[PDB]
From Swiss-Prot, chain C:
Interacts directly with Csy2; part of the Csy ribonucleoprotein complex with a probable stoichiometry of Csy1(1),Csy2(1),Csy3(6),Cas6/Csy4(1)-crRNA(1). A Csy3(6),Cas6/Csy4(1)-crRNA(1) subcomplex is also formed. Residues 69-90 are annotated as: Disordered. In this bacteria, Y.pestis-subtype CRISPRs do not confer resistance to phage DMS3 or MP22, but instead are required for DMS3 infection-dependent inhibition of biofilm formation and possibly motility. Keywords: Antiviral defense. Transmembrane segments: none annotated. GO terms for biological process: defense response to virus. The gene is csy1. Disruption phenotype: Mutants lose phage DMS3 infection-dependent inhibition of biofilm formation while there is normal biofilm formation in the absence of phage infection. Decreased production of crRNA in the presence or absence of phage. Disruption of the entire Y.pestis-subtype CRISPR region disrupts crRNA production but does not alter phage resistance (possibly OLNs PA14_33350 to PA14_33310, and the flanking CRISPR loci), indicating this CRISPR is not involved in phage resistance. CRISPR (clustered regularly interspaced short palindromic repeat) is an adaptive immune system that provides protection against mobile genetic elements (viruses, transposable elements and conjugative plasmids). CRISPR clusters contain sequences complementary to antecedent mobile elements and target invading nucleic acids. CRISPR clusters are transcribed and processed into CRISPR RNA (crRNA). Cas3 and Cascade participate in CRISPR interference, the third stage of CRISPR immunity (Potential). Involved in crRNA production or stability. InterPro entries: CRISPR-assoc_prot_Csy1. Coiled coil: none annotated. Belongs to the CRISPR-associated Csy1 family. It holds the Pfam family Cas_Csy1. This is CRISPR-associated protein Csy1.
């Protein structure tokens, strides 16, 4: 009857690194390997009452009593120096390949059927649209999440590292390449072909991606931020903690991965928002609403159980979404 | 049971995954019975061919690391485990919680016999070292120090000193060799006198409660802490009889049908970790077997300590 | 005394079990009440209990904590009290003994049928004697009473041949003259349950929590408390602790092992004091062991003299520990770089540097190798003694009395030993 | 759930619930009037006694600091 | 009648040390004694729900409420430094002698029969094929596991330490030697001769195995994840924990042993996977399925009782599998 396997664990293709952010100046970004790293320093904030009240403290006496005695916090803040306007963010991506093969599989016949499904996909339409959209999401600096929203000029340099040497260099203007339109460019098509060769298993692709963004002298940059379980008083009301590896601010690798996975333009809702991150049940935490819900038959799990188990091949864009989920990797499979 | 004619210093030995659960009541550093059994296995394997006897082991414990973790919200600890292979039906087997520890210990071995006069000291020292480099000490493999900077050979020091000052200088140099560690000794007299002190404090108090009181941090109201003479760990002090000594072929599924088997219960005593410069002689630190097989009581201790 | 009250109590017990299983089943049809009362309402249930007492076993030491696919002989035996002093065991458990139950998870009801208090005592000790009220309160016939008593008292005696499985531990012990004993150990579940109960009273008892609150309020209390740090949890049953034993179902896993740890079980790091002025007051003194030793000396310096010399003996032992740690500090200074003392610096405690780095004599052939041999630096502990003079209390009552004289005497003796240790570093 | 009132102390949770680990969690806040002293993330499976015992150490520390801060003077 | 011994246990021959992981640059592998160790750090992840739903929480309201509650974990991560593209993995292997000698045996007759069976195995062909496969699994860095998957170049240096010096140095290209083909090479045959002499000897043979993998600059290395049971505690814990010895990431010795024992290419199922680890009842944890079942006559126990008791000597491949189990060890014996 070809039941799906209990474990269908997939490895993560397009493996990113922790994107370290340093600081420097524009027109000195060619020699940027000596640039000093952005430090995660500390500062204090005085938080006034600016949230919605619960229709019990709305009296003026208790509101003025709370406002008379406010609350102080210590925040980890990452800023550029006052003589550095350009933020540099550096990470290495590793395009592995073999996306159809899962790492763990309880059923051998289901693994064979999934391998045949991915093989028939690659024979029909290989990793050409997917690698084009991944090269798009690398070309615009979407991994600069809040470091791109007010940036004057963003430039992305991607170097193909072969035997410790740069095999091929790409230099993209990340503001010209939009965050919502997947157009065509010759250098972008070359990068798409390189990521296609990496994903097909025909070559080993490692890329060094360095993004330079003009934010401003001393402007606050936005690295990854850590969860804080306890604030307390021994720790001086630590409300925000940013991520750093060794006295050097950085973004998490999975944030770069989520920004790179933002290729899904084929969800059943309108594409006026643009692409969303590739995920089962197409979930966006900022929107708070699942595109591709399990009720409307267009999510990853029902499309995979139709494409593989019952040989119901979906549309070309939907099978692009399914193979993009397979590239993303996960703990797909029931209990 | 005898004074050693010589002391052989097995150097820093890195035991990889030693049995961290020393006893049904204690965890941490392994049993001294493991060390005494290792020295008896060394005498069984290479001691007889060298015409020497290897009795008595002094443990220094230069480094200890426990493969443990502290879960959030609890002040206790749990043991990190190993993934056992699956069963024949592809399911996960039942987990037996076994803890592991990376040790780095150096051992003082009491050597007596005519073979000390028949071989050079470095020859028998190198022979017992290369025998011990392919054995186990508490359930863990011994790392035999490959491709580091400077390997450490033994130093067998004859305890029959020509002069008292030369013997003293030899013992102080041997103590200086095993410096970043703590000699683990047996404290039956201290535990017994603390039991008598508690019995004067409160009657019908067992030796278990006196052992427990010598390990917990006691808080006294005026809020200070009741002090201890030393580290005062709870050690497995041996095995007591739980059954009559059956015949060698009597016990079903025994390890061998030539050795008699007797079911035992763990004996718990008080041990102390001291800096090894606080001893009169390094032969006091040797852990000796003491069977007394008519009454059970298969103990290991440190006789001639104080 | 009378057999009638024992009969009333056992009939009340089986009626309570009948109404409990009737409330648990909640049956209103399908003749389940008749089938439930046809096997657990009369003496035949006791006969059914005769089919259940042979499966269960009352033990004090079991093998099933060792690997649960092992089938050995779990035995109930109290070990003899050893004549040698200063060691404990399960022989210390006298009347404070709880006997573990092994076997099926459904026959265990009859365990309370052997653990009631009808006449004021446990019924296993009632059935171990040929009492007048015994053998009549449970059976009208004599032979049925005899076989029921034998089957009910067989839960204590070990069943089967004496055996220990392959997965059980067996450990050779050398005899004094030419022999070995195989010595398979069993898990002392009664002793472990007693220790776990004592730790439960010590850590979660009402009096212990009241003393903890009194410590938190910094007030007085008639009794103290304990903490038991660095405990370890060893769960035997993975997801079914009831399959191990009944006492391991009482404490679900949670072996609660005591921390038998060496003092170097939490070795933090080795650090080189480069830009600092004195090792004893800046880097060595900030370690927690000598911190607790210095607070202990501060507490013991300003104290009464009623136990004085004995306290002074402890004080002498206490002060010995500190210089021991100094050697231990130098011991981990043998684990550092060979030539850290030759690095550039304005102030790096060069008076102590002859003893801080003994390996620089290998680095320099004659620049500093002969300096430590000719100088023989043993005065550094005197500098450490100056730091140890900051470990004493600033009380004029000690200086007026001979307490300062005894403190100076034991200080001079222990730094004499320390200087003699530091003298022969060249060998 | 609801606030825990220990004298002048109020342990009030955030209305939002997080999922630290896999289990759901809530950010519980300890106030002495308008001043907060400890914000701690605690599971939703915690009872009121466990939430009280989590902040009991900071409560006792503040009580000790108040005793040693407003102690009356001593005449000898 | 030659009954089987009720206890039958064997020592772990080829017992490796914990694979110490450090970082550096390629072509600096000769001076790798001062390479800084890979340190395991902590980081925070905020994912979204992507597991399978069991048709009771697939309504959009409950799914959107589950997304609206943020899913957070703390994970232990090991990364390379951003200036070190090479991961060095170093361990020590002790080939112990007396491979066919059990630690425990009840029957003296069964011990004599087992020793005679192993002695006839050494007199017929020796450990030559088994040590060839062990030298293969040393020669390709299978013990790197997921560190071997997307590496540009893996090179393994194996040094024989006789007394205190390198008696013989082997250098292997780990990517050229496949994970599934056991071919013949001169250096591989010399390493096989050394390992087989160590198995046939009375003492032990000491080897230092170092593997350099050109994973990529700053990439994610994969040490062994520690098996810690949550045990149903109320407080949430860190989802992923790693293994280290002293501020230095490491792989467990049993994982290195499992990779070294991945020589079994004689199981009755098809060798689409290739070699599997030598286990009784052929258990593979990555598949959830156990090959060499006892219902076939190819599990280790029935093969041993046929070879030893009933003198039914199996095929040479199954004899290799049985002696590979004896080198592997294990606790056997019926009740």
């Amino acid at each position: 009857i070809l039941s799906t396997a209990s474990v269908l664990a997939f490895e993560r293709k397009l493996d990113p690194s922790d994107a370290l952010m340093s600081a420097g100046a524009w027109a000195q970004r060619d020699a940027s390997q000596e640039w000093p790293a952005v430090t995660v320093r500390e500062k204090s904030v005085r938080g006034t009452i600016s949230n919605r009240l619960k229709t019990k403290d709305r009296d003026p006496a208790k509101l003025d009593a709370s406002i008379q005695s406010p609350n102080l916090q210590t925040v980890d803040v990452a800023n550029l120096p006052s003589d550095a306007d350009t933020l540099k963010v550096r990470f290495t991506l590793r395009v592995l390949g073999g996306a159809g093969t899962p790492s763990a599989c309880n059923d051998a016949a289901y693994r064979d059927k999934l391998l045949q499904t991915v093989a028939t996909y690659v024979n029909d339409q290989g990793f050409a649209e997917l690698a084009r959209r991944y090269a798009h999401n690398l070309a615009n600096a979407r991994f600069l999440w809040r470091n791109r929203v007010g940036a004057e000029a963003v430039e992305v340099r991607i170097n193909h590292i072969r035997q410790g040497e740069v095999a091929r260099a790409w230099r993209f203007d990340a503001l010209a390449i939009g965050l919502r339109d997947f157009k065509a460019d010759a250098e972008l098509d070359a990068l798409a072909e390189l990521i296609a060769s990496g994903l097909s298993g025909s070559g080993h692709v490692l890329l060094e991606v360095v993004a330079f963004a003009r934010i401003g002298d001393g402007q606050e940059v936005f690295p990854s931020q850590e969860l804080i379980l306890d604030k307390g008083d021994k720790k001086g009301q630590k409300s925000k903690t940013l991520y750093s590896v060794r006295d050097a601010a950085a973004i998490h690798s999975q944030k770069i991965g989520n920004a790179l996975r933002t290729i899904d333009t084929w969800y059943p809702d309108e594409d006026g928002l643009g692409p969303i991150a590739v995920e089962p049940y197409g979930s966006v935490t900022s929107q708070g609403k699942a595109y591709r819900q399990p009720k409307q038959k267009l999510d990853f799990y029902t499309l995979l159980d139709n494409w593989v188990l019952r040989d119901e091949a979906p549309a070309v864009e939907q099978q692009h979404y399914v193979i993009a989920n397979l590239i993303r990797g996960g703990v797909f499979g029931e209990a | 049971v005898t004074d050693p004619e010589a002391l052989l210093l097995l150097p820093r030995l890195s035991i990889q995954n030693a049995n961290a659960i020393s006893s049904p009541l204690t965890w941490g550093f392994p049993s001294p019975g493991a060390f005494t059994g290792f020295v008896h296995a060394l005498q069984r394997r290479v001691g007889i061919s060298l015409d020497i006897e290897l009795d008595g082991v002094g443990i220094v414990c230069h480094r200890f690391e426990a493969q443990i973790s502290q879960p959030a919200g609890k002040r206790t600890k749990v043991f990190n485990l190993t993934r056992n292979p699956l069963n024949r039906d592809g399911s996960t087997a039942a987990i037996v919680e076994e803890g592991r520890a990376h040790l780095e210990v150096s051992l003082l071995l009491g050597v007596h016999g005519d073979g000390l006069d028949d071989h050079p000291a470095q020859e028998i020292a190198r022979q017992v070292q290369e025998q011990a480099g392919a054995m186990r000490l508490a359930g863990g493999s011994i790392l035999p120090w490959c491709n580091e900077r400077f390997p450490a050979p033994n130093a067998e020091l004859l305890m029959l000193g020509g002069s008292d000052e030369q013997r003293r200088k030899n013992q102080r140099r041997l103590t200086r060799r095993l410096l970043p560690g703590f000699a683990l000794v047996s404290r039956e007299a201290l535990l017994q006198q603390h039991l008598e002190t508690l019995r004067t404090t409160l009657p019908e108090a067992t030796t278990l409660d006196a052992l427990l009181d010598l390990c917990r941090i006691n808080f006294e109201p005026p809020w200070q802490v009741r002090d201890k003479p030393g580290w005062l760990v709870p050690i497995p002090a041996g095995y007591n009889a739980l059954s009559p000594l059956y015949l060698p072929g009597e016990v079903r599924n025994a390890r061998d049908r030539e050795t008699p088997l007797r079911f035992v219960e763990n004996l718990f005593g008080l041990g102390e970790w001291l800096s090894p410069h606080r001893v009169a002689a390094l032969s006091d630190l040797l852990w000796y077997h003491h069977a007394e097989p008519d009454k059970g009581l298969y103990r290991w201790s440190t006789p001639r300590f104080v | 005394p009378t057999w009638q009250e024992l009969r009333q109590f056992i009939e009340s017990f089986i009626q309570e079990r009948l109404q409990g299983k009737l409330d648990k089943l909640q049956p209103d049809e399908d003749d389940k009440r008749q089938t439930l009362l046809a096997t657990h309402r009369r003496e035949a249930w006791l006969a059914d209990a005769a089919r259940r007492v042979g499966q269960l076993q009352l033990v004090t030491h079991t093998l099933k904590p060792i690997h649960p696919d092992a089938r050995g002989s779990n035995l109930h035996s109290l070990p003899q009290a050893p004549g040698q002093p200063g060691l404990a065991g399960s022989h210390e458990l006298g009347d404070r003994l709880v006997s573990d139950v092994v076997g099926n998870a459904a026959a265990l009801d009859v365990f309370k049928f052997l653990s009631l208090q009808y006449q004021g005592k446990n019924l296993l000790n009632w059935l171990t004697e040929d009492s007048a009220e015994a053998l009549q309160a449970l059976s009208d016939n004599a032979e049925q009473a005899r076989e029921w008593r034998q089957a009910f008292i067989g839960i204590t005696t070990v069943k089967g041949a004496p055996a220990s499985h392959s997965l059980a531990k067996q450990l050779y012990f050398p005899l004094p003259g030419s022999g070995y004993h195989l010595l398979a150990p069993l898990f002392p579940t009664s002793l472990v349950h007693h220790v776990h109960a004592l730790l439960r009273e010590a850590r979660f008892g009402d009096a212990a929590k009241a003393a903890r609150e009194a410590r938190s309020r910094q007030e007085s209390w008639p009794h103290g408390f304990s903490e038991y740090p660095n405990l370890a949890i060893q769960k035997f049953g993975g997801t079914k602790p009831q399959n191990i034993s009944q006492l391991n179902n009482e404490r679900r896993g949670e072996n609660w092992l005591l921390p038998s740890l060496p003092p170097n079980w939490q070795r933090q790091n080795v650090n080189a004091p480069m830009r600092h002025s004195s090792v004893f007051e800046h880097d060595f003194g900030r370690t927690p062991e000598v911190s607790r030793l210095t607070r202990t000396l501060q507490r013991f310096l300003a104290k009464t003299v009623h136990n004085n010399l004995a306290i002074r003996q402890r004080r002498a032992q206490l002060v010995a520990q500190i210089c021991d740690e100094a050697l231990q500090y130098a011991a981990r200074l043998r684990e550092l770089e060979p030539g850290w003392s030759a690095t550039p610096g304005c102030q790096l405690h060069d008076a102590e540097q002859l003893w801080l780095d003994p390996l620089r004599a290998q680095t320099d052939e004659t620049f500093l190798q002969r300096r430590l041999r000719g100088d023989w630096p043993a005065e550094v502990g005197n500098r450490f003694a100056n730091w140890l003079n900051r470990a004493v209390s600033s009380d004029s009552q000690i200086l007026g009395s001979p307490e300062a004289a005894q403190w100076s005497q034991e200080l001079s003796k222990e730094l004499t030993m320390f200087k003699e240790i530091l003298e022969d570093e060249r060998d | 759930m609801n606030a825990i009132h220990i004298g002048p102390f109020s342990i009030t949770p955030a209305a939002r619930g997080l999922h630290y680990g896999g289990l759901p969690h809530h950010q519980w806040t300890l106030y002495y009037g308008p001043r907060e002293m400890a914000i701690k993330t605690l599971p939703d499976s915690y009872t009121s006694s466990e939430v009280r015992d989590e902040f009991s150490d900071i409560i006792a520390e503040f009580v000790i600091d108040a005793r040693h801060r407003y102690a009356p003077d001593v005449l000898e």
